[PDB]
Symmetry: D3
Subunit: 253 residues, 6 copies
């Protein structure tokens, strides 16, 4: 078997990928999402009740389908990154990255020694298909994609430095934490926040990195796609489920 | 503690209850549904991957919310009915009921001896809250509601007889199995099927029993509510999740 | 490896075994109960929210401890009995046994062909420890113990017939279903019910079979032990947990 | 989406398919087995500790791989068959089939009304991918494959009658139950048993049905393949795990 | 929906709240404990085998009942605190707090930016009921309650400094870790230890914070209540289950 | 009850113990491995998809069998070590230990105050069998065994310093991470790497500590046993399963 090709990673340089946030934290819900045809599915280990084993179950469901999996761990924790890579997550979105130093450590956490600090356990891991991918330890690094989130004043204060870190493939901007960090908690729609988001996306793309964002607002999503944003999540499973059920009940109250 | 009051059962004689089909088979998804404000939630043990333990998890989630739980077991299996009552399901929807004899057996399956054949295990059961409901074995039968589904030619051929069974509180008509039994599999919208559904609802209400139905079609749902149908399910969680995600992706293809 | 000796089965003829009801339906709770020193633990598949997989987890917990496991399936279902024997349950308590014809079928359900109808699948089963017990298909039947419950008027109407079935090792009387069946639901304490229980125990022992019963009432339990009742369960984990927490809160209200 | 093509079913008429028994009852173990390259994987609901939900997880794992899933339910239970088809099992192996009448009922259990008695619930089912397979209710029957097991003297006494049942695609012979039924429990190797197996395979293929068998004995397996047996399982995951670990320890004792 | 009112937090200033430790690590066991009537239930993520998902299940169980949930995470880990607040835990008990600096970080961990460092993910969280609590991001901080444990000499050496931290609502003293830290491991009953506990409770209440403690000793528990201690846990589910089962067996040996 | 004797710990000074790696992450698979007769089983929390709850299930499975359990946590995390000791893991293998300062912290993490920093919670823990081991807080430390892994240049740079830490019972060398760290990723077989392994084993034994290693290569494993290596793991469950299934399929292609 040749290593699973990371089409998400390749597509960062060739197209704009449309994404769905997967927070229902369940192999069955992840499979329903995997049937729709999103370019990428964000399995949320930070804001949904997931652990290594529930994320594994969702990778297995989604694996039969074209949609590429991206895993957001709870934090840039090196051992947890080691766990998620070995279960076969090929793209990670690291929350709350605030310095070049922290971004380089995340690069190392995703690469085998001697170049990085990823723990070696290929015989045991879905990632190597238990060594059925015969050359895994030689070929793994090529198909790993590292994304970091900038979501604080300190991250924005270190944006140019993070953007010069080799091995950061993309910077994702989450309007929720960023709006809140800027003193507009719950109101990312403010001009002050939007101007900072647009400038940030411009700087990201100017430095040759992929820019990413989430917006459930169709107008803002299409605006971010007009700027060339490479990976745009356009909704959240929990929100779509809740709103579709509320909208239906309102027709009957 | 007094026994949990079955408001679904009481409401069969006082209003028209709007329902959501719960087939995501998960305590977390059941809780999202429980927040919307449906009158009733159908926990589907027949067509969703549920077992006694996953149904228990969904009863526990939903229990904090006003929405009344209805459990559809996989079949009119007496021991399985015993299990679902002891985990605290107070309303059951029995699929594929086709005779007075089978309907009376389902009544007995829901009532303690000597009047019925429900196995006695109150010390162990969430239903008695492990005997924290001190009078449970005296008061349980009052708050149990039995619904049966008519979904075959044989059931329609035995409708008058089922409708004279004391302890059948309601007859639910599932257009899917009924359309299929009538040779219009996948097309319940045919006039031949709809005329049979309307006549069936009329006969059900004429015999003093509650009529129920499911339709994701808003026009048919409101038509069934205009006829006085007592319990109408207006959608399905799996369908709302899939369609909301497909509709959103179509705005971006 | 030699097959696990069924000490419960042997002790039916040499001593009186003290039992605890396990309805907390969980490997971790079953292990707590396993530490106490009960002669037997009844893993309740009829009145607690258990399936084959949760019962297997409880057998694995308990296996490190001297306490012998007895499993009560939801009903005398031949395929379910097959499942529970293959996960390694060596003693079964069959609910709701009402005829010699039904007792004989339960005997066959527990014995391999050609003498019985137990499905053969030893390579796969914990019961054979996946063929690490090399002679399992030759030795299995010797260490299987079959108990049946008489809990209905019809059972009591067929008691002499059930007691002449070879391979029924014991008859358990559950006062809850029996009291209910006799029109004293929730009050097994009545003289009418108790006289029937005592006579029933006497007839069971007179026919050379083991008698069993459950009572959380210390006085009744010691009374049943004075009659020579071979297997006596003296409490229920769910009840002890609830009562201990209630008594404790009462000291501080 | 078009319905998943049942390649196992097609190959019954075009090649000889090599199978692995999957009784580790686990999505993770099922995925390891799925990477090997077996033509078919037998998810054992009869002799391994599986339920609908654990079988769903194993289907989801295996779905990303070419290996075709075959599910053996605990028994020819019509409601359980309904449940396994809806989670998306396209091939079923029914244990303990003993008459044409029982085989015909299993055929109907797998087909929608009006031809069959399969309960209709496509909106909810992974089988229809929650109606993302738009024609599912029209196209589903064509990709369903029904195998039955003959494992008793009564089955052998009804073999010609079972073989004339339209819609039985295959008869599988399990030497374990059959050897036991013939009074050679745990010694299927006996000439008396093997002559019966060979004759049975010849009769099955003579009637234009697929023959199937399991043998962990390489010689017997290759013999059955020389007879033209269409589906041959050649080992069992539990057995290969235990034996591989025992062989390794023996090199070091 | 308005945000769940944190009655535990309000009662810290108006009454003395009686608590039960919940370490059976199970939604079913948590629900049994929830029926008793304790003012608060301590879901122990530090000393019972719990993770985010098992704590969520226990929150869902308990939610239908008046008893207030308090969650003890394994350590003052900011990302884990983020995870427990989002699943909807409104009161946290932080183990092993030893400095004002650490207590201030725990305060911030529980509050949204710009005041605190709690990660923003309201669309996904049971805490916001998936934004069905429409003002959640504005109202969430008011219903969050932060308790810290002082259980080391260093903590006692920093007690006045921890007590001056705005946003620490309560200091809990666990005699087990504190007795051990003082060189009396497993004998918190010693006068040297008790004088320290009494003095500590007096200092905590003198600084206008709530004092808390656990003791299974009724006399010590009632003594701590006579001192005005605001939250007193009076037993542990694991201990009451084991002891109740041991006491019962001893009546029969 | 007396505390469980750690035979693994005792045997470090009296014999050479043969080990199997358990990465199938499942109570049912851990029990199959437990039947074989390995001296020790390594429950891998670093490279297999395990959490505290799945490790507890595997400890419960294995506990019925003579094989001693060793747990490898994901990292030398003090709170996680606390969790794993409380579920009853008596031998820990700490990955990625690189200094005497880190080894000493791991020693303290495994010992109660005042000598160590292990959090006290014996009422709640399987480790004390919920205080059924009456003297647990006095006797626990004697039966705890601490192993550390040297797997980096920095570890080898600190080997003499780590080897002088009292309370480090053993140093395990994992050829995978070490080979990788040395610039021979995936080829531990190189003379440069092997010479370092042999010298390392010699230095470990010269300092009075137990040496450990894993090799699936029979020749290397016997070589390590001839040097007197005290604990040698000779295979990996995931690898044996995959290889046994691959070899078997190869006979029939
Ligand atoms: Ca978990
Ligand atoms: Ca289950």
């Amino acid at each position: 078997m040749v290593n699973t090709v990371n089409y998400f990673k390749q597509k960062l340089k060739t197209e704009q990928q449309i994404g769905m946030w997967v927070g229902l934290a369940d192999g069955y819900c992840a499979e329903i999402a995997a049937n729709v045809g999103y370019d990428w599915l964000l399995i949320d280990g930070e804001h949904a009740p997931n652990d290594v084993r529930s994320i594994l179950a969702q990778l297995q469901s989604i694996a039969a389908y074209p949609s590429q999996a991206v895993v957001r761990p709870v934090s840039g924790d090196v051992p947890l990154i080691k766990q998620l890579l070995d279960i076969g997550a090929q793209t990670l979105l690291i929350p709350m990255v605030e310095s070049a130093e922290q971004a380089e450590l995340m690069v190392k956490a995703t690469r085998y020694p001697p170049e990085g600090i990823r723990g070696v356990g290929a015989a045991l891991a879905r990632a190597s298909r238990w060594n059925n991918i015969s050359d895994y330890l030689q070929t793994a690094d090529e198909q790993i994609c590292l994304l970091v989130q900038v979501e604080s004043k300190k991250g924005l204060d270190n944006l140019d430095e993070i953007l010069n870190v080799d091995g950061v493939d993309g910077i994702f901007i989450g309007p929720a934490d960023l709006s809140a960090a800027l003193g507009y908690r719950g109101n990312p729609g403010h001009e002050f926040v939007q101007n900072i988001i647009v400038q940030t996306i411009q700087k990201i793309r100017a430095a040759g990195k992929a820019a990413g964002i989430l917006s459930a607002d169709e107008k803002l999503a299409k605006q971010y796609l007009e700027l060339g944003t490479e990976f745009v999540a356009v909704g959240v499973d929990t929100s779509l489920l809740m709103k579709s059920m509320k909208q239906l009940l309102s027709k009957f109250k």
